[PDB]
Write an enzyme that holds these catalytic residues in place. Structure first.
Site, PDB file in Angstrom:
ATOM      1  N   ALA A 228       0.838  -1.109   0.089  1.00  0.00           N
ATOM      2  CA  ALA A 228       0.031  -0.077   0.014  1.00  0.00           C
ATOM      3  C   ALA A 228       0.924   1.142  -0.120  1.00  0.00           C
ATOM      4  O   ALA A 228       1.046   1.791   1.223  1.00  0.00           O
ATOM      5  CB  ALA A 228      -0.846   0.186   1.327  1.00  0.00           C
ATOM      6  N   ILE A 229       1.507   1.352  -1.037  1.00  0.00           N
ATOM      7  CA  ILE A 229       2.290   2.631  -1.462  1.00  0.00           C
ATOM      8  C   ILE A 229       1.836   3.601  -2.211  1.00  0.00           C
ATOM      9  O   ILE A 229       1.156   3.448  -3.018  1.00  0.00           O
ATOM     10  CB  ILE A 229       3.711   1.806  -2.177  1.00  0.00           C
TER      11      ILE A 229
ATOM     12  N   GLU B 141       4.128  -9.975 -13.765  1.00  0.00           N
ATOM     13  CA  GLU B 141       3.278 -11.181 -14.021  1.00  0.00           C
ATOM     14  C   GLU B 141       4.018 -11.851 -14.939  1.00  0.00           C
ATOM     15  O   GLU B 141       3.757 -13.088 -15.272  1.00  0.00           O
ATOM     16  CB  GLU B 141       2.044 -10.479 -14.412  1.00  0.00           C
TER      17      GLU B 141
ATOM     18  N   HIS C 162      -6.231 -15.710 -14.577  1.00  0.00           N
ATOM     19  CA  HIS C 162      -6.307 -14.348 -14.927  1.00  0.00           C
ATOM     20  C   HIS C 162      -7.788 -14.415 -15.448  1.00  0.00           C
ATOM     21  O   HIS C 162      -8.133 -15.181 -16.155  1.00  0.00           O
ATOM     22  CB  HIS C 162      -5.310 -13.804 -16.233  1.00  0.00           C
TER      23      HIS C 162
HETATM   24  O1  LIG Z   1       1.470   3.445  -6.447  1.00  0.00           O
HETATM   25  C1  LIG Z   1       1.273   2.113  -6.355  1.00  0.00           C
HETATM   26  C2  LIG Z   1       1.132   1.265  -7.280  1.00  0.00           C
HETATM   27  C3  LIG Z   1       1.279  -0.003  -7.228  1.00  0.00           C
HETATM   28  N1  LIG Z   1       0.940  -0.437  -5.729  1.00  0.00           N
HETATM   29  C4  LIG Z   1       0.726  -1.984  -5.412  1.00  0.00           C
HETATM   30  O2  LIG Z   1       0.960  -2.992  -6.579  1.00  0.00           O
HETATM   31  C5  LIG Z   1      -0.205  -3.564  -6.790  1.00  0.00           C
HETATM   32  C6  LIG Z   1      -0.428  -3.872  -8.192  1.00  0.00           C
HETATM   33  O3  LIG Z   1      -0.700  -2.440  -8.840  1.00  0.00           O
HETATM   34  P1  LIG Z   1      -1.836  -2.179  -9.542  1.00  0.00           P
HETATM   35  O4  LIG Z   1      -3.072  -2.606  -8.567  1.00  0.00           O
HETATM   36  O5  LIG Z   1      -2.066  -0.856  -9.732  1.00  0.00           O
HETATM   37  O6  LIG Z   1      -1.807  -3.034 -10.687  1.00  0.00           O
HETATM   38  P2  LIG Z   1      -3.167  -3.577 -11.640  1.00  0.00           P
HETATM   39  O7  LIG Z   1      -4.199  -4.446 -10.707  1.00  0.00           O
HETATM   40  O8  LIG Z   1      -3.860  -2.088 -12.033  1.00  0.00           O
HETATM   41  O9  LIG Z   1      -2.793  -4.034 -12.754  1.00  0.00           O
HETATM   42  C7  LIG Z   1      -1.246  -2.783  -5.934  1.00  0.00           C
HETATM   43  O10 LIG Z   1      -2.405  -3.651  -5.668  1.00  0.00           O
HETATM   44  C8  LIG Z   1      -0.609  -2.360  -4.762  1.00  0.00           C
HETATM   45  O11 LIG Z   1      -0.522  -3.207  -3.983  1.00  0.00           O
HETATM   46  C9  LIG Z   1       1.141   0.274  -4.753  1.00  0.00           C
HETATM   47  O12 LIG Z   1       1.048   0.130  -3.486  1.00  0.00           O
HETATM   48  N2  LIG Z   1       1.260   1.691  -5.149  1.00  0.00           N
HETATM   49  O1  LIG Z   2      -2.743  -9.169 -20.475  1.00  0.00           O
HETATM   50  C1  LIG Z   2      -1.851  -8.894 -19.146  1.00  0.00           C
HETATM   51  C2  LIG Z   2      -2.958  -7.754 -18.692  1.00  0.00           C
HETATM   52  O2  LIG Z   2      -4.181  -7.860 -18.665  1.00  0.00           O
HETATM   53  C3  LIG Z   2      -4.865  -6.822 -18.187  1.00  0.00           C
HETATM   54  O3  LIG Z   2      -6.234  -7.354 -18.619  1.00  0.00           O
HETATM   55  C4  LIG Z   2      -4.567  -6.758 -16.931  1.00  0.00           C
HETATM   56  O4  LIG Z   2      -5.310  -5.281 -16.268  1.00  0.00           O
HETATM   57  C5  LIG Z   2      -3.110  -6.164 -16.725  1.00  0.00           C
HETATM   58  O5  LIG Z   2      -2.892  -6.018 -15.288  1.00  0.00           O
HETATM   59  C6  LIG Z   2      -2.316  -7.365 -17.362  1.00  0.00           C
HETATM   60  O6  LIG Z   2      -2.779  -8.462 -16.546  1.00  0.00           O
END
Ligand SMILES: O=c1ccn([C@@H]2O[C@H](COP(=O)(O)OP(=O)(O)O)[C@@H](O)[C@H]2O)c(=O)[nH]1
Ligand SMILES: OC[C@H]1O[C@@H](O)[C@H](O)[C@@H](O)[C@H]1O
Ligand SMILES: O=c1ccn([C@@H]2O[C@H](COP(=O)(O)OP(=O)(O)O)[C@@H](O)[C@H]2O)c(=O)[nH]1
Ligand SMILES: OC[C@H]1O[C@@H](O)[C@H](O)[C@@H](O)[C@H]1O
Ligand SMILES: [Mn+2]
Ligand SMILES: [Mn+2]
Lengths: 274, 274
Positions: B53-54, B232, B162
């Site tokens: 939680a940054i 990922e 996913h």
């Molecule tokens: O400014 C940030 C960006 C990311 N995160 C952490 O990294 C995780 C993955 O980032 P995000 O959820 O933005 O990725 P997404 O789910 O949008 O692909 C977040 O859930 C947070 O736990 C954070 O703490 N601060």
């Molecule tokens: O395909 C990879 C990408 O798929 C999106 O749907 C997702 O938001 C991204 O976080 C990443 O997983």
């Protein structure tokens, strides 16, 4: 490079392939043997197979052993442990590379109940299995292999669905139903009916199981009761309380003469001899 | 006393419930939670849950934490590990018995790629997890629990399908496809597309995985490439080579706003927040 598993199109829709404690139930079409073989090879897995051949049952070893060589853990290291009262009677069967056989001499016990029952005792011989193998597989000798039996079975603890009870309801299961027996299972309990003829797991879990079953049988003797199906009864009580991490389908223990070859069995792997 | 599993009448015939390496795929109706709860209680299991939680993401902790208390490992021991650049910003959420929370202070990294990517590094902090928990579960903070997430997930190593790729073919998977990246997966390989937002396992396996992914990311940096989906991508390459012992269905990582609630999802357990 293999078929992509597709999460919306199951391979087996006709059978239960997972228990409700999330143990796989092993049926043909549930596994890719190539993936598994690599996994187990990467750890140089050694599998021990124990078999008793006391009195006239020495007659079954030649076919047991010849067919094990064609079908059991082919490509992996295997150590057969033949428990017999007749060491000179053990046939010399030529073995594949990385496979070996030891003859262990033991006593011919009073009656068939005890021969079958004292297996648990005789398997538990403990220091040695731990050093030599990673898994132990414990089977009847009066059987033949007819198709692949491989590393898909390997797991910490497994039993096999009795081929006569897989389609049946639980009050139908021939568990021990006398509360006097350590093997007692109430009429409202039980997951499956496992056959005594094919169980196994890691060396630690098989030593545990066989120690427990032996301790339970001795307690019943000291109390003047003999569980209704003997070692199988205690096996079933152990597996109720310590749930197996894989269950083998009846593909792994069948009798074609009594039961035919139903469509739900895509392979008959390990079968009874007359 | 529970429903008898019946081997000839599967519960889920609409989905794949086992991978071809015999790992359960966790869907509602595949497990009896009561059996599993007993199993895990009998070992006094402690589950750690890590969450970053940054910067502005501290805003997501209150709902994350409140919903985790209603739905995550309820009845088991839980230790939350909140990694934050803002310790005073962590909400005080009242916890159930046997549940506790630690705040770990870390650096706010340059960009979002690195914040997401340096999680692998920051999780690998090693001496401590081994002593305090039996399993580690690593999730995004921008989420809420809406239904049971419990011990059915626990296993040596798991990832989660996913929610955008579970119905898809593999050449469709957004794996890293440049051979310059440690994350490279050829066009003819891959089992599934796992999301970076929810993976875990035993402490030993998660330490392994996160060490590997960090070592792989650093090798890519030293070579001037960044895998296409960052952590990922490396996660997916690790899980191709070290296959997970359970896979979570998309019930465990969903977005109802983007994807609705299809009939194949009987529960939506852990979902994205706007
Ligand atoms: O400014 C940030 C960006 C990311 N995160 C952490 O990294 C995780 C993955 O980032 P995000 O959820 O933005 O990725 P997404 O789910 O949008 O692909 C977040 O859930 C947070 O736990 C954070 O703490 N601060
Ligand atoms: O395909 C990879 C990408 O798929 C999106 O749907 C997702 O938001 C991204 O976080 C990443 O997983
Ligand atoms: O005289 C005997 C009776 C039994 N057994 C062993 O105990 C196992 C189980 O006995 P059996 O096969 O007779 O039981 P069943 O399969 O008929 O129920 C046999 O496969 C042998 O391994 C043996 O070696 N000699
Ligand atoms: O019901 C228990 C019994 O079932 C029979 O079919 C089998 O031959 C016996 O060995 C024992 O398993
Ligand atoms: Mn027999
Ligand atoms: Mn997120």
């Amino acid at each position: 490079v293999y078929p992509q598993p597709k999460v919306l199109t199951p391979c087996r829709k006709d059978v239960l392939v997972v228990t409700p404690w999330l143990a796989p139930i092993v049926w043909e079409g549930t596994f890719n043997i190539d993936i598994l073989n690599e996994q187990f090879r990467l750890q140089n897995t050694t599998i021990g197979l124990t078999v008793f051949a006391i009195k006239k049952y020495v007659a079954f070893l030649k076919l047991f052993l010849e067919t094990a060589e064609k079908h059991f853990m082919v490509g992996h290291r295997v150590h057969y442990y033949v428990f017999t009262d007749q060491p000179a009677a053990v046939p010399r069967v030529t073995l594949g590379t990385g496979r070996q056989l030891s003859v262990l001499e033991v006593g011919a016990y009073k009656r068939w109940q005890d021969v079958s029952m004292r297996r648990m005792e005789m398997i538990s011989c403990e220091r040695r299995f731990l050093s030599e193998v990673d898994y132990l597989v414990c089977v009847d000798v009066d059987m033949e292999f007819r198709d692949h039996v491989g590393v898909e079975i390997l797991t910490p603890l497994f039993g096999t669905l009795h081929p006569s009870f897989y389609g049946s309801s639980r009050e139908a299961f021939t568990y021990e139903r006398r509360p006097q027996s350590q093997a007692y299972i109430p009429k409202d309990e039980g997951d499956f009916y496992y056959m005594g003829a094919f169980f196994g797991g890691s060396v630690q879990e098989v030593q545990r199981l066989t120690r427990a079953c032996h301790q339970a049988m001795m307690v019943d003797q000291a109390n003047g009761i003999e569980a209704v199906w003997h070692d199988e009864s205690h096996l079933n009580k152990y597996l109720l309380r310590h749930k197996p991490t894989k269950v083998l389908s009846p593909e792994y223990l069948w009798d074609q003469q009594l039961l035919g070859w139903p469509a739900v069995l895509r392979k008959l792997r390990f079968t009874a001899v007359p």
